[PDB]
Amino acid sequence: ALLSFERKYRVPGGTLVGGNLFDFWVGPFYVGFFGVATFFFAALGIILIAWSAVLQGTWNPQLISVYPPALEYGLGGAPLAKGGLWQIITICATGAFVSWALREVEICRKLGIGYHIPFAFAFAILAYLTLVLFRPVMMGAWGYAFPYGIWTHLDWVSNTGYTYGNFHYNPAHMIAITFFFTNALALALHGALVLSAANPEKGKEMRTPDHEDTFFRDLVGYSIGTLGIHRLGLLLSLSAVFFSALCMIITGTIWFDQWVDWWQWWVKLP
Amino acid sequence: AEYQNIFTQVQVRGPADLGMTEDVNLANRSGVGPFSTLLGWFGNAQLGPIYLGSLGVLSLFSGLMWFFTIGIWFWYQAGWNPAVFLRDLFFFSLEPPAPEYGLSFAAPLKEGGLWLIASFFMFVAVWSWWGRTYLRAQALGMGKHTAWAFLSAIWLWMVLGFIRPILMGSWSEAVPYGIFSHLDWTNNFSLVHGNLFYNPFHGLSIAFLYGSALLFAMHGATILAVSRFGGERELEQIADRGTAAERAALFWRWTMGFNATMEGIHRWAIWMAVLVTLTGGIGILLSGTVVDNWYVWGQNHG
Amino acid sequence: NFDLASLAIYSFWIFLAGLIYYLQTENMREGYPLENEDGTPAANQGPFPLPKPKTFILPHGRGTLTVPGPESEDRPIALARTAVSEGFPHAPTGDPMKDGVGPASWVARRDLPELDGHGHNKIKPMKAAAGFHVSAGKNPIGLPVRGCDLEIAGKVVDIWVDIPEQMARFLEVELKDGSTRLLPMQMVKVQSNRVHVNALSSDLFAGIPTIKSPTEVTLLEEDKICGYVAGGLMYAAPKR
Ligand code: BCL
Ligand code: BCL
Ligand code: BCL
Ligand code: BCL
Ligand SMILES: CC[C@H]1c2cc3[nH]c4c(c3C)C(=O)[C@H](C(=O)OC)c4c3nc(cc4[nH]c(cc(n2)[C@@H]1C)c(C(C)=O)c4C)[C@@H](C)[C@@H]3CCC(=O)OC/C=C(/C)CCC[C@H](C)CCC[C@H](C)CCCC(C)C
Ligand SMILES: CC[C@H]1c2cc3[nH]c4c(c3C)C(=O)[C@H](C(=O)OC)c4c3nc(cc4[nH]c(cc(n2)[C@@H]1C)c(C(C)=O)c4C)[C@@H](C)[C@@H]3CCC(=O)OC/C=C(\C)CCC[C@H](C)CCC[C@H](C)CCCC(C)C
Ligand SMILES: CCCCCCCC/C=C/CCCCCCCC(=O)OC[C@H](O)CO
Ligand SMILES: CCCCCCCC/C=C\CCCCCCCC(=O)OC[C@H](O)CO
Ligand SMILES: CCCCCCCCCCCC[N+](C)(C)[O-]
Ligand SMILES: CCCCCCCCCCCC[N+](C)(C)[O-]
Ligand SMILES: CCCCCCCCCCCC[N+](C)(C)[O-]
Ligand SMILES: CCCCCCCCCCCC[N+](C)(C)[O-]
Ligand SMILES: CCCCCCCCCCCC[N+](C)(C)[O-]
Ligand SMILES: CCCCCCCCCCCC[N+](C)(C)[O-]
Ligand SMILES: CCCCCCCCCCCC[N+](C)(C)[O-]
Ligand SMILES: [Fe+3]
């Protein structure tokens, strides 16, 4: 089915690959070649997760866990049940995420809109790849990657974290967190501001963007503007994920010791 | 480069914008500050005016008194020497009273008394600031969403520094005023409580903190992607849907099977962000008062 | 429900489901109910009901919007269904850029200018904007405008600015016959010597829709202008 206004937009064109071969929809979803690619990568990776579940012996999704190969396997392939399934699932994962982003590009082109969304999605994909690829290759073993399980991958975060003391002292970690917190603060304020203008006090007409600017000038003495807040929100969330990947790419690879001592570049100056 | 609307190409200026008046007491408005062409590449160039009423003066004064209460304590820990001050600034810490002083305000100034003085100043600065966020909207005839969202952050800061310490029986449970020390407080908090990763409200808090970066990346990119159709003029798109709002919605419908409206996306947004500190405050509040060990708590439930 | 932590977490999950259900219906105030490709309503609408209407009171006597309500494009759509089966593209039945379909689409917005907080036209050419001028970056007025065919379509004779938000939104461009068209600021690249437009070739500027007044632009006109320009990315692509 279609939204009431959707039909005029459902024209041919915009594909990157296949011409009009995959230029169609299934319900709301656009397909395209990379929609077919996403479906194949996602279905296969989901099947191997299903088969890694029978090998583990559970159907409880809180217990299923697909582990990367033992650290000794280095950067080499592994038998299915000892890191191989993880290895193939990681390939399908990467395939689906990349296909998804390319499908998004085809959608942008058919709609005539900027490409900011798949570009932003790419930051998330490079953060995933930082953890399952760039860092494990830098360090020489697939086993430095996180396991695919709801709770096991949190254990991975705690294990990895406390191997380097208090990660809190990693300066790139501090920057990433600052961006994450500032982002949620900006999101809350941006959502609140628009809603407070579209839904003013009872007995009032709709406010205008001028009221939004006035409110934040009155409040903090500066208004970034309607365009700026969307630039800022993109910049905050992407910078959060960039510095997250940077804090991990510099971890185990260029930095090996406990993080609290990074700072005595400062406190033990003569 | 095909233009990406991330930096203004041509800045323009007219008479400085003094703002909507509505019911704002214009007495308490500052003059306009200087224009920053640097800021104007990314957002507005105009600085000011700002509003400073009774509440704003109170919160500012009380806020500076909080800062200077921690400042003088940092100088005393630095033996009043400007070199050790600048060197160890991240290491100084104004700590709460020790657990023996309980919930008492009799702790001496040098082992908890000054923390209590600071906390009082901070409590007045924050709550009068919150009244400001309510009154600044009210004066303009706007909804109270900002004050309401701000309450969510305040809830967490209140649980950490005041509500949970009180339910625990001592100020010693509260957060120290220091850069590195409060990080250490955070780490040790999770250790003494059996790993915060197993506090399911901490897991929700994280999902919403991640989800906030997800949604803002999605929404910021979307609006920039349709700015070529006036998409960032979201209020008029709400009152009179244009092709920006339609193409924005169809991008997401065609991508993930469903979509928002120009208005509705800001409800997703406010709730995504507010839930961060809402769930977080709950999880902290249950820690030590109801649940001593989250991992052990987690194992017996399922 | 064991202890208070268990009751709390179970409660929060029931609340979150309530919240998601509310949030989703709030986001069905435009475009719903879903329709089949012939414009009749679809059988399965999903498990979320349509929201009860809400009203916005537009300022400056411009009336009230109630949503959801009866939807209509309020314009002819020059496209034709291709397949008996649903899910296939529809075919433009004319010039999609002149007809406004596909990525050239526009919405039948109100044929009135957006007003600022004081009830005055929000977007005004500088020549009628009491006090306005350029403050940083390359002043584009007077520079030539170039298309994706690398030919010159005209010259920038002004700038249409957002008066309350103090921003540049359109370049007014004079064509060879002495008439003007507005170009969306987000679709141009102002360089040292030129203003490059990659969406249109030089000869597609004259087809940019025109405005009734020399010092005001309606929302309808803006939609028409911005959709046409963006639609060039797909429909002027043989020339690029
Ligand atoms: C959530 C669980 C923990 C916690 C865990 C962490 C972790 C983990 C990190 C921080 C980080 C920071 N935290 Mg902390 N933090 C907590 C509670 C607090 C409280 C409070 C009112 O309770 C405050 C004021 C702070 C303040 C700070 C900042 C110093 C810094 C960036 C925050 C941010 O992005 O703000 C968003 C808001 C804005 C950008 C606008 C306002 C900005 C200013 C800077 C806010 C801080 C004021 C501060 C008093 C000024 C210090 C001045 C210098 C010492 C001279 N935290 C609780 C107890 N916090 C990060 C850091 O860099 O630490 C060194 C970091 O890595
Ligand atoms: C005990 C644990 C340690 C610690 C150790 C670590 C370790 C170890 C790491 C971090 C990392 C991070 N930590 Mg730390 N950290 C600690 C304390 C904190 C505190 C705090 C309040 O004290 C905070 C706020 C943070 C904050 C953060 C962020 C900066 C960052 C996580 C986000 C990220 O990278 O996203 C990036 C986003 C992603 C990876 C998501 C990618 C998603 C992909 C592209 C697509 C998914 C599609 C999906 C499968 C589709 C499914 C189906 C559909 C839903 C329908 N840490 C303590 C001291 N921290 C991580 C990091 O930087 O990673 C790079 C990391 O690895
Ligand atoms: C980012 C830095 C760290 C990390 C640290 C943490 C910490 C710390 C926590 C989580 C939490 C979660 N993380 Mg993790 N996590 C990482 C990488 C991932 C990746 C990935 C492919 O990169 C995925 C899919 C997840 C997924 C998840 C969820 C189980 C959960 C909620 C996240 C959320 O809402 O995010 C924002 C996104 C959204 C709101 C959109 C919806 C996302 C959906 C719900 C993801 C579901 C994934 C699904 C279960 C698995 C694939 C399904 C296939 C059908 C097989 N994490 C890396 C290693 N993650 C929290 C939790 O409660 O864990 C139990 C938690 O406390
Ligand atoms: C070793 C560390 C422990 C741990 C210990 C804790 C503790 C302890 C806490 C958190 C909390 C949080 N943790 Mg944890 N956390 C760990 C691992 C992680 C990881 C990770 C990938 O490893 C991540 C992503 C997170 C993520 C998070 C967030 C979801 C959450 C904080 C929300 C927030 O906005 O706070 C920041 C926002 C605030 C503090 C509110 C501030 C409001 C006040 C009013 C602002 C006043 C400003 C003041 C006036 C300054 C003036 C300056 C002006 C500029 C003038 N944790 C491990 C297990 N985490 C919190 C939580 O809610 O837990 C359930 C918490 O208390
Ligand atoms: C949804 C939850 C998120 C959230 C929401 C949120 N926060 C909010 C709001 C909202 C909706 C507000 O409305 C409110 C606000 O006004 O924002 C602009 C606020 C805000 N959140 C802030 C901070 C903040 N929020 C945080 C977090 C979050 N806030 C969550 C992630 C964090 C952290 C640690 O993550 C911080 C630090 C403030 C900027 C602001 C509330 C302002 C306030 O209470 O101020 C007290 C008043 C003072 C005067 C403070 C003391 C003064 C300084 C210490 C001065 C020191 C400098 C020196 C003296 C300089 C001056 C001299 C020179 C100029 C010469
Ligand atoms: C870079 C800034 C933030 C960001 C941005 C971002 N994410 C995005 C986008 C953008 C701009 C999209 O356009 C895209 C989207 O469509 O969102 C609706 C996406 C998206 N971000 C998603 C998730 C996500 N994003 C996250 C984070 C972030 N996304 C960043 C903080 C997180 C976390 C943990 O923080 C998650 C979980 C999806 C909702 C979506 C990507 C959907 C997608 O790729 O679909 C195709 C793939 C599948 C349907 C399934 C593939 C399955 C695999 C083959 C098997 C599973 C393998 C996996 C490794 C298992 C993990 C196990 C866990 C227990 C750890
Ligand atoms: C020249 C003299 C001027 C002095 C210059 C130095 C001032 C630096 C202040 C740092 C505060 C540290 C803030 C970081 C952590 C704060 C956490 C917090 O507020 O905790 C909640 C508390 O328990 C309930 O109020
Ligand atoms: C005493 C406190 C001093 C505080 C000093 C600055 C605080 C900056 C905090 C967060 C950044 C997010 C700020 C911008 C969030 C605005 C939300 C929004 O929509 O504003 C856009 C524009 O101003 C309307 O059109
Ligand atoms: C794209 C990310 C790459 C992650 C892992 C790639 C390792 C390749 C190993 C091949 C698997 C060996 N096998 C089939 C026997 O399991
Ligand atoms: C990023 C937020 C900080 C911005 C605060 C700036 C407020 C400007 C007030 C200037 C006062 C003008 N004056 C001196 C005539 O009153
Ligand atoms: C978060 C605030 C970021 C604002 C910083 C602005 C950086 C200056 C960018 C100048 C742009 C140069 N140019 C040629 C593209 O106009
Ligand atoms: C308002 C947007 C709704 C987003 C939904 C977020 C759900 C995340 C679920 C994570 C589960 C955490 N935990 C501890 C219960 O497992
Ligand atoms: C694992 C938890 C994450 C669940 C979030 C996925 C939501 C999918 C909803 C897609 C709706 C598609 N459809 C056909 C109903 O339009
Ligand atoms: C949610 C707040 C309710 C707190 C109940 C009273 C707290 C006082 C301390 C009780 C000790 C809790 N205990 C015995 C499980 O550790
Ligand atoms: C994890 C939070 C995201 C929850 C996703 C909500 C799914 C909404 C499904 C909307 C149904 C689409 N439909 C059929 C009404 O058009
Ligand atoms: Fe917005």
Residue numbers in the entry:
A (entry chain L): 1 to 270
B (entry chain M): 1 to 302
C (entry chain H): 9 to 248
Original paper wording:
For LSP crystallization we used the hanging-drop vapor-diffusion method and for LCP crystallization a microbatch crystallization approach. An analysis of RC crystal structures obtained by lipid mesophase crystallization revealed non-native ligands that displaced the native electron-transfer cofactors (carotenoid sphero­idene and a ubi­quinone molecule) from their binding pockets. These ligands were identified and were found to be lipids that are major mesophase components. In the carotenoid-binding region an electron density is present that resembles a carotenoid molecule. However, the size and shape of this electron density do not allow the fitting of a full-sized sphero­idene molecule into it. The M162 phenyl­alanine side group forms a kind of ‘closed’ conformation. In this position, the M162Phe side group occupies space that in the previously described RC structures is occupied by a sphero­idene molecule.
In this work crystallization techniques were selected, tested and optimized for the lipid mesophase crystallization of the Rhodobacter sphaeroides membrane pigment-protein complex, known as the photosynthetic reaction center (RC). In this work, the photosynthetic reaction center of the purple bacteria Rhodobacter (Rba.) sphaeroides was crystallized using various crystallization techniques. This transmembrane pigment-protein complex consists of three subunits L, M and H, and ten electron-transfer cofactors, including bacterio­chloro­phylls, bacteriopheophytins, ubi­quinones, non-heme iron ions and carotenoid sphero­idene. It should be noted that the RC of Rba. sphaeroides is one of the most well studied membrane complexes. The Rba. sphaeroides RC is a prospective object for structural and functional studies of photosynthesis.
